[PDB]
Write an enzyme that holds these catalytic residues in place. Structure first.
Site, PDB file in Angstrom:
ATOM      1  N   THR A 182      -4.291   5.184  -1.782  1.00 54.67           N
ATOM      2  CA  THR A 182      -3.256   6.253  -1.341  1.00 54.67           C
ATOM      3  C   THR A 182      -1.210   5.760  -2.287  1.00 54.67           C
ATOM      4  O   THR A 182      -1.282   6.894  -2.630  1.00 54.67           O
ATOM      5  CB  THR A 182      -2.249   5.276  -0.132  1.00 54.67           C
ATOM      6  OG1 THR A 182      -2.272   3.786  -0.587  1.00 54.67           O
ATOM      7  CG2 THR A 182      -3.228   4.932   1.208  1.00 54.67           C
ATOM      8  N   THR A 183      -1.840   4.498  -3.314  1.00 51.36           N
ATOM      9  CA  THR A 183      -0.919   4.709  -4.482  1.00 51.36           C
ATOM     10  C   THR A 183      -1.254   5.561  -5.597  1.00 51.36           C
ATOM     11  O   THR A 183      -0.822   6.290  -6.293  1.00 51.36           O
ATOM     12  CB  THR A 183      -0.589   3.000  -4.727  1.00 51.36           C
ATOM     13  OG1 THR A 183      -0.653   2.358  -4.006  1.00 51.36           O
ATOM     14  CG2 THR A 183       0.489   3.062  -5.756  1.00 51.36           C
ATOM     15  N   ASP A 198      -8.032  -1.672   5.480  1.00 46.66           N
ATOM     16  CA  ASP A 198      -8.470  -1.205   4.187  1.00 46.66           C
ATOM     17  C   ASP A 198      -9.850  -1.342   3.988  1.00 46.66           C
ATOM     18  O   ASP A 198     -10.865  -0.249   3.960  1.00 46.66           O
ATOM     19  CB  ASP A 198      -7.354  -1.475   3.216  1.00 46.66           C
ATOM     20  CG  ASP A 198      -7.817  -1.010   2.310  1.00 46.66           C
ATOM     21  OD1 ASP A 198      -8.713  -0.264   1.434  1.00 46.66           O
ATOM     22  OD2 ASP A 198      -6.807  -1.206   1.146  1.00 46.66           O
ATOM     23  N   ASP A 209       0.587  -1.132   0.156  1.00 47.43           N
ATOM     24  CA  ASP A 209       0.327   0.252  -0.402  1.00 47.43           C
ATOM     25  C   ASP A 209       0.761   1.391   0.075  1.00 47.43           C
ATOM     26  O   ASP A 209       2.176   0.897   0.609  1.00 47.43           O
ATOM     27  CB  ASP A 209      -0.780  -0.128   0.945  1.00 47.43           C
ATOM     28  CG  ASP A 209       0.087  -0.485   2.199  1.00 47.43           C
ATOM     29  OD1 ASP A 209       0.472  -0.233   2.118  1.00 47.43           O
ATOM     30  OD2 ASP A 209      -0.748   0.287   3.774  1.00 47.43           O
TER      31      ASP A 209
HETATM   32  N1  LIG Z   1     -10.662  -6.706 -10.274  1.00 48.11           N
HETATM   33  C1  LIG Z   1      -9.848  -5.118 -10.789  1.00 48.11           C
HETATM   34  N2  LIG Z   1     -10.166  -5.481 -12.077  1.00 48.11           N
HETATM   35  C2  LIG Z   1      -9.217  -4.385 -12.843  1.00 48.11           C
HETATM   36  N3  LIG Z   1      -8.655  -3.436 -11.734  1.00 48.11           N
HETATM   37  C3  LIG Z   1      -9.139  -3.231 -10.703  1.00 48.11           C
HETATM   38  C4  LIG Z   1      -9.635  -4.409  -9.499  1.00 48.11           C
HETATM   39  N4  LIG Z   1      -9.278  -4.124  -8.689  1.00 48.11           N
HETATM   40  C5  LIG Z   1      -8.567  -3.642  -8.298  1.00 48.11           C
HETATM   41  N5  LIG Z   1      -8.172  -2.648  -9.820  1.00 48.11           N
HETATM   42  C6  LIG Z   1      -7.492  -1.056  -9.777  1.00 48.11           C
HETATM   43  O1  LIG Z   1      -6.314  -1.314  -8.853  1.00 48.11           O
HETATM   44  C7  LIG Z   1      -6.130   0.260  -8.587  1.00 48.11           C
HETATM   45  C8  LIG Z   1      -6.254  -0.227  -6.648  1.00 48.11           C
HETATM   46  O2  LIG Z   1      -5.056  -0.766  -7.069  1.00 48.11           O
HETATM   47  P1  LIG Z   1      -5.057  -1.239  -4.950  1.00 48.11           P
HETATM   48  O3  LIG Z   1      -3.358  -0.991  -4.854  1.00 48.11           O
HETATM   49  O4  LIG Z   1      -5.671  -2.297  -4.610  1.00 48.11           O
HETATM   50  O5  LIG Z   1      -5.153   0.435  -4.663  1.00 48.11           O
HETATM   51  P2  LIG Z   1      -4.467   1.718  -3.957  1.00 48.11           P
HETATM   52  O6  LIG Z   1      -5.436   2.386  -4.439  1.00 48.11           O
HETATM   53  O7  LIG Z   1      -4.242   2.086  -2.450  1.00 48.11           O
HETATM   54  O8  LIG Z   1      -2.973   1.242  -4.891  1.00 48.11           O
HETATM   55  C9  LIG Z   1      -8.474   0.641  -8.732  1.00 48.11           C
HETATM   56  O9  LIG Z   1      -7.574   2.313  -9.890  1.00 48.11           O
HETATM   57  C10 LIG Z   1      -8.818  -0.442  -9.718  1.00 48.11           C
HETATM   58  O10 LIG Z   1      -9.070   0.482 -10.571  1.00 48.11           O
HETATM   59 MG   LIG Z   2      -6.348  -0.308  -2.414  1.00 50.82          MG
END
Ligand SMILES: Nc1ncnc2c1ncn2[C@@H]1O[C@H](COP(=O)(O)OP(=O)(O)O)[C@@H](O)[C@H]1O
Ligand SMILES: [Mg+2]
Ligand SMILES: Nc1ncnc2c1ncn2[C@@H]1O[C@H](COP(=O)(O)OP(=O)(O)O)[C@@H](O)[C@H]1O
Ligand SMILES: Nc1ncnc2c1ncn2[C@@H]1O[C@H](COP(=O)(O)OP(=O)(O)O)[C@@H](O)[C@H]1O
Ligand SMILES: [Mg+2]
Ligand SMILES: [Mg+2]
Lengths: 525, 73, 518, 520
Positions: free
Chosen positions: D89-90, D386, D56
């Site tokens: 956060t990313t 989260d 994260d």
């Molecule tokens: N099943 C999925 N298929 C495609 N994209 C996804 C999926 N799940 C999450 N995402 C994408 O991942 C991004 C967020 O990544 P994540 O590391 O889970 O949270 P963070 O925003 O804290 O980095 C979001 O912009 C979302 O669009």
């Molecule tokens: Mg996330």
């Protein structure tokens, strides 16, 4: 621009590994750990001699203990150590198996990712293959009877567990004492086993054959005022907490003796307090007194001349165990010591342990005693420690079998059967993910290979032959003939592994290897 | 473990081959040879001399105190 | 039941050698195929090089493991024997050593693995021979195809249209294409000068000198009569101790006049033969040219080239058909080299270059001049031209041509796996591992191009299983297609030498069981 | 004499700003490879040797030691986004770095920072308005669809974590832990207890309260460990022999009074214990320690004692059973003792855990999550936090939006269309803003090992006129309707990410000069 900018504090010394090279380093460290743990696997395995920073040495085969004392610095090795310790915590057996399985899985993962496949895809394939293996393992298992009337399957399982350890010199009485201790302590209605009621105590000298199971309590004390008799017959015991000393309030206090008459009154009060203490100990009728906090000379002599043996300075847990064994109640004051609050003792005896000055007491119960004690004797401190950790492994296996009741026929048969199920499932699977499944099959199937290599046989040919036997005749209880008695069938050889132990091995190794594959970047000073 | 990556620590080492049993055997044989010259009614006793506090000196024949006093590694 | 084999150091040494070889192979894995990008090596002194040839990358990189050193020797041996494939041979050796590490882990004696690898190589050579097709000279199209294929994986690839035809013309203008059985690259003089761009490379049938004209009055000569000189045009001096004693005032005049007359005599004998350009060998212990001698030569309207290396006399004689003279009495026009034109060209302020062109006498020698902006591209361009020349040399050596782009080794992998499936025993696994360790090349070609390695290799195996031979990776299409129609071919000798050399060096590596510091 | 103190280092002009921008990209590169289901993991080793493993943005950026003020601004934006909505956060760090990268070409020449700051402000205001006016709300207030929405949001939150393969097992689980909370959604009312050993699917949600065995004395292991309808006596008084006031002095001159005072101390302790017992309670809990005498007293009467319980666990027991903590013992009434369906002490992975389960009206929860290593369970706890934060935020309004880069592409298309009517130089800056907002699907494709350019071109073509909600389908290696694929995110995370990224970009651009003092 020309100016080099600084963003991270002390960034000129920090090191960073990124990309596939970091994963290669992870897999390499895991392979080194697995190769270290490979030799000490199976009945023909050899111990390891670990020396700590103090210089004290211990010879052991328990993989969790070996890795715990392995003073290692690589982070992947730390994760492997935590894996082994957690497998020891949840089950108590198969601590080396998880390490070997994780190492094999990571090696197969390295081979796969050399062909440009995503690590997360490898992890997903590992998870699917782990699910298939656990389902097949639950399908293949059969149950034993956890009862006192027919205890023999418990002895078979404990004897299989006690293999590959020095206590296999006896290998029959160790399993008996483990099964008896767990059966006595266990609360069958709740299917719970408490390890605080099994006071595993060891002492050097004698032989490993002398390790017995007292259905009572052994304590490392001696009768105070040695003039009293060294043993008593079936006696009423008075477990006690308050010391045999004149009382004093916890709140700070001042007792002003303002006259000679006050001085005489204080003297008389102290003397009569001792006298009344002894009189109200005797009036209950108890032959033996036990005090946690010790006492003084006058109490010793009054106890002696009143024909009431006693011991002192017994620890808290020892007091609790004594009171559980004898059936009495712990009372914190003399004024509330009734006849009902005494316990019963089959016999209380003192033992001297040869020429040494050390002494101990044994309390043997003629009634139901929820507590027991495993007493270990041997010729080395290393033998004693290895014996007690091996017996802890046996007790953990027995309690695991109490709480699950299902077994599989080990010796490599379970791994080979799971490998065949995984491969058969991977046959009817779309490509780009069957590679991970087959890698999982091979990685879990390395365990018979290591077993045979430790046994001295040729690994690959023997493993292929036993796998062919398993697939020809539908007998999934064919394993590596490690002890060289013929009969690849492992039913007759009576090898038993617990179902929860093996399924925990598979699941825990799969989760650890998934975490290891997930890691990409390393930043370390 | 001779691999081009070292994992133990600055001071921790591993002998996972005939080196380990070589060291164990030579140490055990050294202890046995130390005790060997004190057997039978014709055995001759030894001197144990300290290298420090009070310089304790003891003449003894039984191997228990000989093995207890000296510092093995 | 069996030998305990208490010693474990041999196993540790074997695994260390295998790991080092695999690491060295992976180091240059990403420098293979057209999509592989070259490495940059800077040695201890501040000298840098931009190298894509595996032999150069491995030589400049000062390795420390014995397996790595054996691999670099293997690469240089493959370069010597063939000249192309010096990356693929190292990759194959490292890959199949990494394959055999698990064979060692499976409880197989190294000798069995070595013998089984020898048998697999024996089968693979026959497989490669069957897969090939005959190639015969005077077919300029296939020669251009092979040259372009050799040059595709280099920086000069975009210049290959203006650099491969001259690369093959250089070889075709040196050796007779009827009865050759070998060619020499010594008489292919690669001269490099800084400046210009690559599109300014030239091939000259004449002779190229980096020397400079001493008399800066004459620059061009039409109908040149070149004559080498091996003696010295200076005041006479015997081999043994030389001394002149003067005792009178007329003696100084006599010695000056006599020395001038001797020099003038030598120059007159040189001129009376019709020689119009002179080539003086680089002489030490005696001034090759005297200022008075040079003055006389300039007076008689001649061009003089001095300071010519001793080792270049053979090259000059083979080029312009002249014969050296070591005595003035044997200087005759009957053995004087002739050429249509001699020119001295200024290279746009970057250098001064001497050309002897149109030699009337036959010349079994050509010269390539390579141009580039900076020195690094010039070095890499001459190395790439050398690689193309070595490819043509391979074609001349034995006349056998196979397809490329991963097709030969993937077909070999299929055939050898099928052969291993009929070899029941302890060698079946070893032949299978050898067969499946030669899929590293197609996988590397796939992943270096950004393709999907798993699916590309699987589709390649499927395509070759159906007998659709000569089907391989295509980076223009971005997939798998027939390679012969895409004009990518290589001589068979490169592949056979790579396979055989890799197998022999791997057997040698497997025979090792201990390392000791001397 | 010089104006400033010696060793003062000042940087002015365009090169300082460009160096700050480059530092921003370098610090955002450290968390770039941790997006989407194929997201990777970062291991950070402290100076003490402890290694933390996570993926994260907030935790990784916090762990990194940052001394560059612009990289410090990126760290602060990541941490604030973590503290506001919990998830995303990313995205904020990547968006800020991509804004700065897209605009640095324009700052290379003489572009006044105020105009690009104004362009960011306008673009982000329009983007937030579009997100508010595009997100769909069911507006039905039905329990089944609310549960489905929360489950899908939690599942999307669990992706890109260590608990991916068990999404469905954990997601709905945490939903229950938010279902059984009161109308305050306090985060202290759901506890997380980590224990070694066991598989990832062995984790459980205790609807009552569970806590590790605090301590025991000589007398424990005798009172029964199973009660079928007990009453819990939550207490705050230590039951042991002690001084009455820590300054009380006893002054007597007769032995009779001395014995009377000793018996008096024993009598006051026994009267306190008798009040506790006569209250009808069967199991007693206390923040303050319980002595051995009280342990034996409760053992002799089939009563369970547990002293030195943590404050948070005791308050959770209050919220589960429904009692109240009494510091005083004189007033153990019948409506203050909490009651539970079952109390049971069990063995979990080498530890003893007390369980109060079956509470009918429970406003608390407990997470018994398993793992193999301490970092494994810590990362599982991070992912669970989260998810619970995202469900907690989404419970206030069930307005959702498709994830997987669909919303970023929609805003990019909207801004591209808008930046054609506006004349002048602001058109180029708003176009740069949209091209920067185009980063998330590209990075998702890069982490998934796709052809990022091809998938982006397909998204742009299919999304200019072919319909919104289209994001990247990782499993199918293609583009797909992510709303119909049940990849849902609350709109507040994207709103907050956009506004924070705009604020940080404006703060970074609005600097022309920096000064470093000799740090005395
Ligand atoms: N099943 C999925 N298929 C495609 N994209 C996804 C999926 N799940 C999450 N995402 C994408 O991942 C991004 C967020 O990544 P994540 O590391 O889970 O949270 P963070 O925003 O804290 O980095 C979001 O912009 C979302 O669009
Ligand atoms: Mg996330
Ligand atoms: N008599 C036997 N014959 C064949 N295999 C055995 C026998 N006893 C134990 N094994 C196998 O040896 C493996 C390792 O057992 P052991 O080393 O005793 O403990 P751990 O499982 O903790 O390593 C087990 O997987 C078991 O299947
Ligand atoms: N245009 C092309 N298309 C596909 N494959 C090619 C092409 N050109 C070269 N290759 C392959 O790349 C491999 C490496 O060749 P190259 O890098 O030129 O020399 P080396 O074999 O010494 O590495 C060869 O095996 C060849 O089959
Ligand atoms: Mg075991
Ligand atoms: Mg080539």
């Amino acid at each position: 621009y020309g100016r080099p900018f600084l963003i991270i504090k002390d960034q000129d010394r920090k090191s960073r590994l990124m990309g596939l090279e970091a994963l290669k380093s992870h897999i390499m460290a895991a392979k080194a750990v697995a190769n270290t743990m490979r030799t000490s696997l199976g009945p023909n395995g050899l111990d390891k001699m670990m020396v700590d920073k103090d210089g004290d040495v211990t010879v052991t085969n328990d993989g969790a203990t070996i890795l715990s004392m392995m003073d290692v610095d690589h982070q992947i090795a730390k994760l492997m150590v935590e894996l082994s310790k957690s497998q020891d915590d949840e089950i108590g057996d198969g601590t080396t198996g998880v390490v070997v399985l994780a190492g094999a899985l990571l090696e197969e993962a390295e081979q796969l990712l050399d062909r440009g496949i995503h690590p997360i895809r490898i992890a997903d394939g590992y998870e699917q293959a782990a699910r298939v293996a656990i389902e097949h393992l639950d399908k293949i298992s059969d149950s034993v009877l956890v009862d006192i009337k027919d205890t023999e399957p418990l002895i078979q399982t404990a004897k299989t567990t006690l293999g590959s350890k020095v206590v296999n010199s006896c290998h029959r009485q160790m399993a008996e004492i483990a099964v008896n201790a767990v059966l006595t302590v266990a609360d069958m209605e709740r299917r719970d086993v408490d390890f605080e009621l099994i006071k595993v105590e060891g002492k050097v000298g004698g032989r490993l054959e002398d390790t017995k199971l007292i259905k009572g309590v052994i304590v490392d004390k001696d009768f105070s005022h040695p003039q009293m008799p060294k043993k008593v017959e079936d006696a009423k015991i008075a477990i006690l907490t308050c010391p045999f000393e004149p009382p004093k309030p916890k709140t700070k206090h001042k007792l002003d003796v303002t006259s000679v008459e006050d001085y005489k009154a204080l003297q008389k009060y102290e003397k009569e307090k001792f006298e009344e203490m002894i009189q109200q100990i005797k009036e209950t009728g108890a032959n033996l007194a036990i005090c946690q906090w010790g006492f003084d000379d006058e109490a010793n002599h009054l106890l002696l001349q009143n024909n009431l043996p006693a011991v002192r300075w017994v620890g808290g847990p020892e007091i609790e165990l004594i009171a559980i064994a004898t059936g009495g109640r712990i009372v914190p004051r003399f004024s509330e010591l009734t006849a009902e609050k005494l316990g019963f003792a089959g016999l209380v005896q003192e033992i001297s342990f040869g020429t040494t000055k050390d002494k101990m007491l044994v309390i043997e119960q003629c009634k139901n005693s929820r507590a027991v004690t495993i007493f270990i004797r041997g010729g080395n401190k290393m033998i004693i420690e290895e014996a007690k950790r091996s017996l802890h492994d046996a007790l953990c296996v027995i309690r695991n079998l109490i709480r699950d009741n299902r077994v599989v026929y080990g010796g490599g048969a379970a791994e080979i059967s799971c490998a065949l199920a995984v491969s058969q499932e991977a046959d009817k699977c779309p490509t780009l993910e069957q590679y991970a499944m087959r890698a999982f099959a091979d990685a879990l199937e390395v365990i018979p290979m290591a077993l045979s290599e430790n046994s001295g046989m040729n690994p690959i040919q023997t493993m292929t032959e036993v796998r062919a036997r398993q697939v020809k005749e539908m007998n999934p209880a064919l394993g590596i003939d490690c002890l060289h008695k013929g009969t690849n069938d492992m039913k007759q050889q009576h090898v038993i592994e617990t179902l929860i132990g093996k399924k925990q091995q598979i699941s825990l190794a799969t989760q650890m290897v998934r975490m290891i594959l997930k890691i990409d970047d390393i930043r370390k000073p | 473990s001779l691999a081009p990556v070292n994992i133990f620590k600055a001071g921790a080492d591993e002998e996972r081959a005939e080196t380990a049993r070589l060291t164990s055997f030579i140490g055990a044989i050294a202890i046995g040879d130390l005790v060997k010259s004190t057997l039978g009614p014709k055995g001759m006793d030894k001197i144990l001399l300290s290298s420090g506090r009070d310089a304790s000196l003891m003449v003894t024949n039984d191997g228990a105190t000989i093995l207890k006093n000296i510092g093995v590694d | 039941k069996g030998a305990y084999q208490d010693r474990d150091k041999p196993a540790q040494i074997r695994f260390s050698n295998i790991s080092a070889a695999k690491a060295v192979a992976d180091a240059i894995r990403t420098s293979l195929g057209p999509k592989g990008m070259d490495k940059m090596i800077q040695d201890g002194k501040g000298d840098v090089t931009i190298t894509n040839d595996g032999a150069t990358i491995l030589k400049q990189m000062q390795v420390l493991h014995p397996a790595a050193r054996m691999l670099v020797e293997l690469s240089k041996a493959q370069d010597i024997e063939a000249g192309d494939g010096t990356t693929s041979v190292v990759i194959i050796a490292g890959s199949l050593l990494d394959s055999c590490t698990k064979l060692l882990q499976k409880g197989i004696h190294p000798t069995i693995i070595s013998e089984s690898f020898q048998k697999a190589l024996e089968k693979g050579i026959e497989i490669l021979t069957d897969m090939s097709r005959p190639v015969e000279l005077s077919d300029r199209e296939t020669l251009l195809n092979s040259a372009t294929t050799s040059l595709n994986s280099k920086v000069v690839s975009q210049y290959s249209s203006l650099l491969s035809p001259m690369s093959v013309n250089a070889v075709m203008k040196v050796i007779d294409p009827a009865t050759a059985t070998s060619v020499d690259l010594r008489d292919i003089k690669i001269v490099k000068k800084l400046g210009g761009t690559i599109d300014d490379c030239e091939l000259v049938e004449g002779l190229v000198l980096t020397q400079k004209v001493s008399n800066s009055g004459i620059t061009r000569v039409e109908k040149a009569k070149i004559g080498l000189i091996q003696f010295c045009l200076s005041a006479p001096k015997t081999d043994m101790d030389n001394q002149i004693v003067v005792s009178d005032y007329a003696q100084m005049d006599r010695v000056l006049r006599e020395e001038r007359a001797y020099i003038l005599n030598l120059v007159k004998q040189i001129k009376k033969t019709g020689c119009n350009v002179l080539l003086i060998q680089k002489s030490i212990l005696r001034d090759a040219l005297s200022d008075l001698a040079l003055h006389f030569l300039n007076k008689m309207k001649i061009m003089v080239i001095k300071d010519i290396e001793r080792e270049d006399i053979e090259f000059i004689c083979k080029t312009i058909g002249t014969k050296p003279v070591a005595h003035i009495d044997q200087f005759t026009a009957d053995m004087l080299g002739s050429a249509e034109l001699a020119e001295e060209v200024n290279l746009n302020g970057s250098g001064k270059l001497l050309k002897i062109t149109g030699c009337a006498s036959p010349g079994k020698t050509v010269t390539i001049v390579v141009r580039g902006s900076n020195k690094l591209v010039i070095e890499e361009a001459e190395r790439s031209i050398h690689d193309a020349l070595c490819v043509i040399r391979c074609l001349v050596k034995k006349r056998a041509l196979i397809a490329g782009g991963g097709a030969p080794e993937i077909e070999l992998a299929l055939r050898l796996t099928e052969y291993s499936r009929t070899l029941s025993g302890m060698e079946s696994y070893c032949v299978r591992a050898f067969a499946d360790a030669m899929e590293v090349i197609p996988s590397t070609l796939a992943e270096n191009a950004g393709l999907n390695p798993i699916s590309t290799v699987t589709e390649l195996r499927n395509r070759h299983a159906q007998g659709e031979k000569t089907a391989g990776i295509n980076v223009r299409k971005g997939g798998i297609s027939n390679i012969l129609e895409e004009l990518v071919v290589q001589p068979l000798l490169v592949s056979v030498s790579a396979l055989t050399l890799a197998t022999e060096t791997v057997r040698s590596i497997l025979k090792i069981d201990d390392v000791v510091n001397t | 004499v010089i104006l400033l103190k010696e060793g003062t280092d000042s940087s002015q002009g365009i090169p300082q700003l460009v160096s700050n921008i480059s530092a921003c990209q370098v610090i955002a590169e450290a968390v770039r490879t941790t997006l989407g289901p194929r997201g990777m993991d970062k291991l950070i080793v402290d100076g003490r040797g402890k290694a933390t493993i996570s993926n994260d943005g907030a935790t990784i950026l916090k762990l990194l030691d940052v001394v560059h003020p612009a990289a410090k601004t990126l760290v602060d934006i990541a941490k604030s986004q973590d503290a506001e909505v919990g998830d995303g956060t990313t995205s904020v760090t990547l968006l800020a770095a991509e804004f700065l990268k897209q605009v640095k070409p324009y700052v290379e020449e003489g572009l006044h920072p105020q105009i690009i700051i104004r362009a960011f402000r306008t673009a982000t205001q329009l983007a937030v308005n579009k997100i508010k006016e595009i997100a769909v709300t069911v507006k039905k207030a039905d329990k089944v669809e609310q549960r489905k929405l929360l489950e899908k949001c939690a599942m999307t939150a669990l992706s890109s974590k260590l608990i991916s393969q068990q999404k469905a097992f954990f997601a709905k689980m945490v939903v229950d832990a938010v279902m059984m909370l009161d109308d305050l959604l306090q985060l202290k009312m759901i506890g997380i207890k980590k224990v070694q050993g066991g598989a990832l699917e062995d984790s459980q949600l205790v609807a009552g309260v569970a806590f590790k065995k605090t301590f025991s004395y000589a007398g424990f292991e005798m009172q029964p460990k199973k009660y079928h309808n007990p009453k819990i006596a939550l207490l705050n008084v230590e039951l042991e022999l002690k001084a009455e006031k820590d300054n009380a002095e006893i002054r007597v001159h007769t032995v009779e009074d001395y014995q009377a005072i000793v018996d008096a101390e024993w009598n006051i302790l026994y009267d306190k214990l008798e009040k506790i017992h006569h209250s009808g309670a069967k199991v007693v809990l206390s923040k303050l320690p319980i002595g051995d005498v009280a342990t034996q007293y409760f053992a002799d009467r089939d009563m369970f004692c547990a002293g030195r319980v943590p404050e948070e666990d005791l308050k959770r027991t209050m919220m589960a059973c429904g009692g109240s903590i009494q510091t005083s013992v004189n007033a153990l009434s019948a409506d203050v003792l909490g009651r539970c369906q079952v109390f049971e002490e069990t063995q979990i992975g080498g530890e003893r855990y007390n369980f109060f389960t079956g509470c009918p009206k429970a406003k608390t929860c407990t997470f018994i999550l398993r793992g193999g290593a301490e970092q494994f369970m810590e990362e599982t706890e991070r992912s669970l936090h989260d998810a619970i934060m995202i469900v907690r935020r989404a419970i206030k309004n069930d307005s959702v939006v498709a994830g997987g880069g669909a919303i970023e592409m929609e805003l990019s298309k909207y801004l591209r269309d808008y930046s054609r009517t506006i004349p002048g130089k602001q058109q180029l800056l708003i176009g740069a803003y949209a091209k920067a907002l185009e980063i998330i699907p590209r990075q998702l494709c890069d982490n998934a090992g796709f052809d990022a350019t091809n998938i982006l071109n397909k998204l742009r073509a299919r999304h200019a006129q072919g319909g919104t909600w289209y994001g990247v389908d990782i499993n199918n290696e293609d583009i797909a309707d992510n709303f119909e694929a049940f990849v849902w995110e609350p709109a507040m995370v994207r709103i907050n990410a956009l506004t924070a990224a705009s604020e940080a970009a404006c703060l970074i651009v609005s600097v022309d000069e920096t000064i470093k003092n000799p740090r005395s």
